[PDB]
Amino acid sequence: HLAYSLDATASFLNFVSSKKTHVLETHRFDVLSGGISTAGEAQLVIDLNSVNTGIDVRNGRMRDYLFETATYSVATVTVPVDLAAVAGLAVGEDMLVDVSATLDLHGVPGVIDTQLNVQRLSATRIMVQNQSPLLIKAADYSLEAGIETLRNLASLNVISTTVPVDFVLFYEAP
Ligand SMILES: CC(C)=CCC/C(C)=C/CC/C(C)=C/CC/C(C)=C/CC/C(C)=C/CC/C(C)=C/CC/C(C)=C/CC/C(C)=C/COP(=O)(O)OP(=O)(O)O
Predict the structure, then answer these.
(1) Pairing between strand 41-47 and 12-19?
(2) Residues of the chain by 3-state class (helix, strand, coil), percent to 5
(3) Cα–Cα distances in Å, from 149 out to 10, 25, 60, 110, 115?
(4) Among 18, 20, 36, 108, which residue's beta carbon has the most beta carbons within 10 A?
């Protein structure tokens, strides 16, 4: 039973790599799914096969050697939500929510303690986004070896193991 469903088309989630001397590139996942149950569990499922770095060979290397998508096709975030506090938002009103979100990525579940911005857009639609810049450390999900494979394949000197993540999620009630 769902209180909300993710609007997958309108929603997005991006991450930024840095290589060499602070050479930044923003990548995205083209396919997201999710919803919020009537029991107050929000989920975001990130299709790791939908990684889009703008370069097909690189996408393949990220699927095969970083995320290892034959084993790990999706990353799943789960967050307890107060549905009454969401219901209580007036149209156009926001609130800050301090969450302990569980991220299941690359076989290593971890908790992300962060703050989300939740804004009501209409009687049925809400927008959820990271309130501040959100950094993921590859080592927290056993992803450093994959980064080293990508580095060595590219003949690069350095690839940063810290990755900023940004998202804007739209959820819609029945
Ligand atoms: C109402 C309410 C509150 C609802 C809640 C809604 C909800 C569920 C919200 C979500 C909450 C939260 C906190 C979600 C968490 C989101 C996160 C953090 C998801 C994880 C995203 C993710 C999988 C990110 C990737 C992580 C990592 C570490 C990736 C590593 C990337 C990396 C460094 C890649 C290297 C790429 C490079 C540079 C390759 C070199 O090749 P190339 O560039 O071709 O070389 P050359 O220079 O030769 O050209």
Answers:
(1) unpaired
(2) 20, 50, 30
(3) 33, 18, 13, 23, 33
(4) 36
Phi and psi torsions of 14, nearest 5°? -125, 155
Q: Which atom of ligand 1 is nearest to the CA of 161?
A: 33
Closest-CA residue, ligand 1 atom 32, reads 17
**Is 74:32 a contact under the CB 8 Å cutoff?**
no
| Residue ranges making up the domain that contains 23 | 1-174
Task: Give the residues across from 81 on adjacent strands.
Answer: none
The domain that holds 8 is classified in CATH as: 2.40.128.110
CB 54, CB 75: distance < 8 Å: no
* CA–CA separation, 143 and 118 (whole Å): 30
Q: Provide the number of structural domains found in the chain.
A: 1
**Ligand 1 centroid distance, CA of 27 (Å):** 7
173: CA distance to ligand 1 center in Å?
27
Question: Ligand 1 center to residue 113 CA distance, Å?
Answer: 16
This PDB structure is determined at a resolution in Å of 1.5
